[PDB]
Symmetry: none
Subunit: 73 residues, 2 copies
């Protein structure tokens, strides 16, 4: 009479393969949603880099015109 260790090993393995495919399909879903939320989060990457640069440019312009007016007054 078997001690059932062979039966236990076969059961573990069966449940191990199937559970792994279920996990994988679940991760594939999470990764697809990640890609989506990442696009969204970076939608305005460029517009932000340029708005920041545009702000610096304007500050310096304002400051220089401020100094011109003072030189004139």
């Amino acid at each position: 009479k078997p001690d059932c260790t062979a039966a236990m090993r076969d059961v573990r393995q069966q449940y191990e393969s199937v559970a792994a495919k279920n996990l994988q399909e679940a991760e594939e879903w999470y990764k697809s949603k990640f890609a989506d939320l990442s696009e969204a989060a970076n939608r305005n990457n460029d517009a932000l880099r340029q708005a920041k640069q545009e702000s610096t440019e304007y500050r310096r312009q304002v400051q220089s015109l401020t100094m011109e007016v003072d030189a004139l007054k």
Copy 2:
């Protein structure tokens, strides 16, 4: 008593149920954690952009006012 591994096989299925559910939970938590981080980051970007724009709105008006001061002063 007849050979029968029914009960041992079932204890094995139940033990691996917990394992599987554990790994599925580990993944859910890791991904939900990244999903909230991307939400935080998007809002941060959107508010950074807005404040940037308002800066330039303000400066633009100043450029206009000052350019005319300059003009009136030079003659």
